[PDB]
Each structure stands twice: as structure tokens, then as C-alpha cells.
Curated annotation (Swiss-Prot), chain A:
It comes from the Eukaryota. This is Tetratricopeptide repeat protein 7B. It is found in: Cytoplasm, Cytosol; Cell membrane. Component of a phosphatidylinositol 4-kinase (PI4K) complex, composed of PI4KA, EFR3 (EFR3A or EFR3B), TTC7 (TTC7A or TTC7B) and HYCC (HYCC1 or HYCC2). Interacts with PI4KA, interaction is direct. Interacts with EFR3 (EFR3A or EFR3B), interaction is direct. Interacts with HYCC (HYCC1 or HYCC2), interaction is direct. Association with the PI4K complex is strongly reduced by TMEM150A. Component of a complex required to localize phosphatidylinositol 4-kinase (PI4K) to the plasma membrane. The complex acts as a regulator of phosphatidylinositol 4-phosphate (PtdIns(4)P) synthesis. In the complex, plays a central role in bridging PI4KA to EFR3B and HYCC1, via direct interactions. TPR repeats lie at residues 58-91, 169-202, 203-236, 282-317, 319-351, 352-385. It comes from Homo sapiens.
Curated annotation (Swiss-Prot), chain B:
Induction: Down-regulated by beta-catenin. Widely expressed. Highest levels in heart, brain, placenta, spleen and testis. Component of a complex required to localize phosphatidylinositol 4-kinase (PI4K) to the plasma membrane. The complex acts as a regulator of phosphatidylinositol 4-phosphate (PtdIns(4)P) synthesis. HYCC1 plays a key role in oligodendrocytes formation, a cell type with expanded plasma membrane that requires generation of PtdIns(4)P. Its role in oligodendrocytes formation probably explains its importance in myelination of the central and peripheral nervous system. May also have a role in the beta-catenin/Lef signaling pathway. It comes from the Eukaryota. It is linked to Leukodystrophy, hypomyelinating, 5: A hypomyelinating leukodystrophy associated with congenital cataract. It is clinically characterized by congenital cataract, progressive neurologic impairment, and diffuse myelin deficiency. Affected individuals experience progressive pyramidal and cerebellar dysfunction, muscle weakness and wasting prevailingly in the lower limbs. Mental deficiency ranges from mild to moderate. HLD5 shows clinical variability, but features of hypomyelination combined with increased periventricular white matter water content are consistently observed. It comes from Homo sapiens (Human). Changing L37P: In HLD5; induces misfolding and degradation, leading to destabilization of the PI4K complex. Component of a phosphatidylinositol 4-kinase (PI4K) complex, composed of PI4KA, EFR3 (EFR3A or EFR3B), TTC7 (TTC7A or TTC7B) and HYCC (HYCC1 or HYCC2). Interacts with TTC7 (TTC7A or TTC7B), interaction is direct. This is Hyccin. The lineage of its organism: Eukaryota, Metazoa, Chordata, Craniata, Vertebrata. It is found in: Cytoplasm, Cytosol; Cell membrane. Belongs to the Hyccin family.
């Protein structure tokens, strides 16, 4: 009981000395010993209780690091933070270790590089790199934080719920920023899935969970969450764009793609152009999947009309011009298609599909050796392609002779052998 | 020049430990009309050969400026054709030369069922995030961005020792590169060559790391606008992870 008395005596001594024109480091030292004796008394009383709450002891403990980090004493401040964390937790220090752990995680994440850190025991489970200890801190904090939740009652009071939601949002924000940079998405997705309990009508967690799911490989769950995101806030057009892009991917769902395309089109120019492009691609694929006669031409004319509209709406998109030229070439109209791909290649001349289509058009025009040359520097720029190899083999067999075709076949067999086990 | 005659008379870290070189060297790379540009380039290579730490630490900060200038102008009028060799040599030296082996950067995630220095379980797998990177011989349009992100990560590893001018320049490049060939440039009124550079997702993530670190060193408006262009371009190009990281950064501000 006398220890807290002398601790408050040191606090009052510092409060009086602040009015006298380095004694500040002496006040800091008395603050450190006051904190040490307060922690020792807490340990003794928590041992005794098997066989209260002051006011200024925490001030004396905290103003030391406040001065540390307001005067630039970053090294001593982080060292004292670490030593305070080294104290064994009791039933009265959980919020203090909350706050100090959160601040330490922030300052370590946004304060210095990797080559300016050493182990807690040494002085410049045992962590070896800063993000490891930050991750451990985040796990422990969230693990023994998840039991003070409010679970969205809102009978009459809201403020405590708002504070709890803020704390959850910030802790998961640090978790996301820590784990995203290192390219680990599975554990992040599971973390957000576990966290999903709190939210009831909040856009942020739904958006982040959908993004994490779509960036991890799973698609259908991402599509459903993205649909609910459509339901929540009908202002953004990028979210239906992502849903449509996933729909026509490996999933091979086509009706939903046209639904989302119609939704985004029926809402600036740079977005409705993308919507028209997606609608045209969906129509072209549906045409390719047809089974009777007339509907193929109907969908082809629809697709070329949409592609023309998209091309007109934006003059500096090489993808739109390339796909319009491809659709034109599907319809056997050569000169306009070759002119269009010429314009697209003028827009950008480092592509692969553009050169491949140019070579294909040249071959369809019966100019074999020029297309052969084009394929030659196409392979020169991309020495590890596969489709270009098949096209070159076909062209060589069509023009010169089987010898070079066999040579290329053996070369590509060797390439596959090298690239795989 | 000052550095020119310094080299002329020149032809243990206390050799320069100089407060007048860095600004002049930065102004040298500004204009493309330099007669000694490639000689001072391989002279910088010669400095990088010196394993002594301060020279490499205080000369690595020049990489973003040249990466913009001579990999966007030559790779759009004039082709110097040797700085790429310097970059390739630096890449090979970094990836290969540590003690005679290739790096495998790795760390292990923590757990909660095992006692730690701060907690107890009463009341573990190794993961790899980089390497191996086999050496290269020419900057092709199929592998140049991988080495670009590797160089960016290597420069990231030591952001502590670079000055504020380097941070300002890095933010300027990180802003102007991703909006150069898009209409938003006329909002920013940035001139030069109107073209689009096909960046990747990892490149965006690695610049976002540096942008986040620089956000808390006084630079506020430039980093804010750079984040704006980054998120705009990511939304345009439909790249999930950079958009997620940008949203996380944005939703964590005072």
C-alpha cells in the first residue's frame, strides 16, 4: 500500500517540477520504478486473492512513453513497450496490453524497415522478423478480444456497439494489410469468414470478403456475395462488371453474364463502354454455342452492332478494336478486318494476339512467307509459347517441307520436357 | 563538372562520408542529352561492385528515376542500350551472390496452442514468399516485369536510409506511370509521351507498400493523389488484390 503512495508521490513531484524553469530524465526514471513497483504489487495481490483501482499510477506509467515518443526517443520507447508487454497478464491489465499491443503493431508496421529490428531478448516462442511478431500480436489480441462483443442487439443503446465495431474494423484492417503484401490469401479469407458474424447491414466487410474470396480461387461463393453487394448499394458499376467477368470465365454461366451486362449498361462513358464490350463478348460466345442456323447469324449481327457501338464510344481502346476486328474476321470480311487490326496494332504493337491474328489474316490472303516472318519475330519476342508453335508448324508443313516441321516438333517436345518434370 | 573532376582525380566508407553529389547526379539523369551518361552508369555499376555498405545504400535510391526515364522513353526515341545491362547485372549479383547460393526467402506463421514470450496456451508450418529466381540474359517482353518487381522489393527492403527527395520522386513516378495513357491525365495536366505501360498486379502491390510507408513521413497530398490514380487504374483494369489493398489503406485514416 505504501508503494502506490510513493508512486503518486513521484507523480506529484513531476507535476510540480514541470513548473520549474536534465531533471526530466530523472522524472522518467522515477516513473519507470513506479510502474515496476505497481506491477509487482499487482502480481502480489493477484497471488494473494486466492488465499484496488487507483487513478494516477497509470498516468505515471504512461506519460513516460508519451514523452518517449513525443521527443523522438523511438528506440527507448519501443524497448519500454516491449518490457511492459513482457509482464504476465492479470485480470487488471488486459485493456492496457490491448492498447500497447495495438500501438506497437502500428508503429512497427509503418515506422521502419526489416533491417532495423532484433529479437525482444537481444538489444541492437522467439520471433525472427517484424511481421511475425506483429501477426502473433494480432492473433492474441483478436482471440481474447472476440469475447467482449455486443453482437448487434440495438434495443436502445448504440454507442458501445459503435466502439466495438470500430475496434473490430481496425483490427481486421491491420490483419488485411499485414497478410496481403506477402501473397497469402487462404488464411485471410478464413479470417474474414470467421469475422463475418458481426456485420448485419455494413457494406465494408461484405465487399472485402467478396474481394478476398474472388482473389483466392473460389468463384460461386464470390458470385453470391457479390450479388448481395448489388442488393445493398446500387451505385457502383464495377461490382456487376466483376460478377459478369467471373460468370463467363471457367464457370461457363452465360445468362447471368448478360443479366449483369444489361444492368450495368442500363445505369461515365468509360464504364458503359466496358459494359457494351462484355455484352458483345457474351453474345459472341452464345453464338458460338448455338445449335441451329438462324440464331447464329442473329447473335453475330447483335455482337457486331454492340462492338461497333463500343468502338465508337471510345477511340483509344486497342482491345475493343481488336475484338471488333476478330468478330469481323469471323464473318469472312477480310479488308475491313485487316484495316481495323492495323489500327489496333498502331495503338499498341507489343501484343501477341494482334500479331497472331495478323499472321492468320495473311495466311488467309495466301501470302505464306510474310506470315512466316511475322510468326518468326512473334516467337522471338515470346520464346515460350505453345499456340504459335502449332501455327508455325502448320505453316511450315504447308509451305516448305516436312523436315522443318519435324525439327520444330522435336524442339517443342524438348521445350515441354524442360518446362515440366 | 564537380563529380566529373572528382572521378578524374579519383582514377574506409569515409571516402564520401558527400553532401553535394546526390543532387548533381539526379540532375544529370534529368535531361537525356548527356555525353557521359553511360560512362557514369557503368561507374555506378563499379560502385555497386564495392561490397562496402554505405555506397550501395546511398546509390540504390536512384533506380526509380532511371526506370521511368530510360525504360519509358527508349521503350516508348533514342536507345542507349546499356542501362538494361546494368539492371540485369545488378539482378544477377543480388539473386546469386549471398554466399554462393540462391535465396529462398521464407518465414513461419505463428500459432495459439504453443507457449510464446507473451502468452500461454493453458488458459507452425513453413511458407515461402520468394525465390528461386534463375538468372536472365535479355529483358524480354515476357519477363522484364518480374525483374522489375524483384528490384522494387530489394529497394523496399531498406527504405530507412533514403532521404525525402527520393520519396517525393518515387511518389511522382508511382502516380504518373499508371495514368499516363488514360484521359485522367488531362485532369492532372501531365505532358510527355501519350502511351500506356502494361503493369502487373504485383508491381502495383509493391509500389503500394512504399506508398503506405511514405504516407507517414510528411508527404500527404502527393501520396493521396497517387493512391487516387492507383485505385482508379485498378478499378478500370479489374485487378482484385490491389483494389483490396487500396481500400484497406483508405479505410484506415484519421
Amino acid at each position: 500500500y505504501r508503494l502506490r503512495v510513493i508512486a503518486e508521490a513521484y507523480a506529484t513531484k513531476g507535476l510540480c517540477l514541470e513548473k520549474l524553469p536534465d531533471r526530466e530524465q530523472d522524472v522518467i526514471t522515477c516513473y519507470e520504478k513506479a510502474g515496476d513497483i505497481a506491477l509487482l504489487y499487482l502480481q502480489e495481490i493477484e497471488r494473494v486473492i486466492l488465499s484496488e483501482l487507483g487513478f494516477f499510477l497509470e498516468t505515471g506509467l504512461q506519460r513516460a512513453h508519451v514523452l518517449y515518443f513525443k521527443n523522438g526517443n523511438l528506440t527507448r520507447g519501443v524497448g519500454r513497450f516491449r518490457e511492459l508487454l513482457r509482464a504476465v497478464e492479470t485480470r487488471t491489465t488486459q485493456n492496457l496490453r490491448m492498447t500497447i499491443a495495438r500501438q506497437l503493431a502500428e508503429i512497427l508496421l509503418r515506422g521502419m524497415c526489416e533491417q532495423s529490428y532484433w529479437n525482444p531478448l537481444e538489444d541492437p516462442f522467439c520471433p525472427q522478423e517484424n511481421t511475425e511478431e506483429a501477426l502473433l500480436l494480432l492473433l492474441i489480441s483478436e482471440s481474447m478480444a472476440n469475447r467482449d462483443a455486443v453482437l448487434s442487439r440495438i434495443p436502445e443503446h448504440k454507442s458501445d456497439r459503435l466502439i466495438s465495431l470500430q475496434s473490430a474494423s481496425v483490427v481486421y484492417d491491420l490483419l488485411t494489410i499485414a497478410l496481403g503484401r506477402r501473397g497469402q490469401y487462404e488464411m485471410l479469407s478464413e479470417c474474414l469468414e470467421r469475422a463475418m458474424k458481426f456485420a448485419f447491414e455494413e457494406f465494408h466487410l461484405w465487399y472485402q470478403f467478396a474481394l478476398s474470396l474472388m482473389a483466392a480461387g473460389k468463384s460461386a461463393r464470390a458470385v453470391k456475395v457479390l450479388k448481395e453487394c448489388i442488393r445493398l448499394k446500387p451505385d457502383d458499376a464495377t461490382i456487376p462488371l466483376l460478377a459478369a467477368k467471373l460468370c463467363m470465365g471457367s464457370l461457363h454461366w452465360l445468362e447471368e453474364a448478360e443479366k449483369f451486362a444489361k444492368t450495368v449498361v442500363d445505369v461515365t462513358s468509360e464504364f458503359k463502354a466496358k459494359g457494351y464490350l462484355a455484352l458483345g463478348l457474351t453474345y459472341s460466345l452464345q453464338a458460338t454455342d448455338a445449335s441451329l442456323r438462324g440464331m447464329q447469324e442473329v447473335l453475330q449481327r447483335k455482337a457486331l452492332l454492340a462492338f461497333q457501338r463500343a468502338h465508337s464510344l471510345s477511340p483509344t481502346d486497342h482491345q475493343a478494336a481488336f475484338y471488333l476486328a476478330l468478330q469481323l474476321a469471323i464473318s469472312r470480311q477480310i479488308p475491313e478486318a485487316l484495316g481495323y487490326v492495323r489500327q489496333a496494332l498502331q495503338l499498341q504493337g507489343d501484343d501477341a494476339n494482334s500479331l497472331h491474328l495478323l499472321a492468320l489474316l495473311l495466311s488467309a490472303q495466301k501470302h505464306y512467307h510474310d506470315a512466316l516472318n511475322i510468326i518468326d519475330m512473334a516467337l522471338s519476342e515470346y520464346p515460350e509459347n505453345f499456340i504459335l508453335l502449332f501455327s508455325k508448324v502448320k505453316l511450315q508443313s504447308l509451305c516448305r517441307g516436312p523436315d522443318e516441321a519435324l525439327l520444330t516438333c522435336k524442339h517443342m517436345l524438348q521445350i515441354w520436357k524442360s518446362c515440366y518434370n | 563538372g564537380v563529380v566529373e573532376e572528382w572521378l578524374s582525380e579519383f582514377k574506409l566508407p569515409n571516402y564520401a562520408t558527400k553532401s553535394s553529389l546526390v543532387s548533381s547526379l539526379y540532375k544529370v539523369i534529368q535531361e537525356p542529352q548527356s555525353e557521359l551518361l553511360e560512362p557514369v552508369c557503368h561507374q555506378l555499376f563499379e560502385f555497386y561492385r564495392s561490397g562496402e555498405e554505405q555506397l550501395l545504400q546511398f546509390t540504390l535510391q536512384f533506380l526509380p528515376e532511371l526506370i521511368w526515364c530510360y525504360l519509358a522513353v527508349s521503350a516508348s526515341v533514342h536507345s542507349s542500350g546499356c542501362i538494361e545491362a546494368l539492371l540485369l547485372g545488378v539482378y544477377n549479383l543480388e539473386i546469386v551472390d549471398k554466399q554462393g547460393h540462391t535465396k529462398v526467402l521464407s518465414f513461419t506463421i505463428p500459432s495459439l496452442s504453443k507457449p510464446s514470450v507473451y502468452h500461454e496456451p493453458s488458459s507452425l508450418s513453413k511458407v515461402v514468399y520468394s525465390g528461386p529466381h534463375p538468372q536472365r540474359e535479355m529483358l524480354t517482353a515476357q519477363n522484364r516485369f518480374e525483374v522489375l518487381t524483384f528490384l522494387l522489393l530489394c529497394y523496399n527492403a531498406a527504405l530507412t536510409y533514403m532521404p525525402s527527395v527520393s520519396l517525393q520522386s518515387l511518389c511522382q513516378i508511382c502516380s504518373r506511370i499508371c495514368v499516363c495513357g488514360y484521359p485522367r491525365q488531362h485532369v492532372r495536366k501531365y505532358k510527355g509521351i501519350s502511351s500506356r505501360i502494361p503493369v502487373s498486379s504485383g508491381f502495383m502491390v509493391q509500389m503500394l507498400t512504399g506508398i503506405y510507408f511514405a504516407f507517414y513521413n510528411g508527404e500527404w497530398d502527393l501520396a493521396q493523389k497517387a493512391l487516387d490514380d492507383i485505385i482508379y487504374r485498378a478499378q478500370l483494369e479489374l485487378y482484385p488484390e490491389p483494389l483490396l489493398v487500396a481500400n484497406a489503406i483508405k479505410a484506415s485514416l484519421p
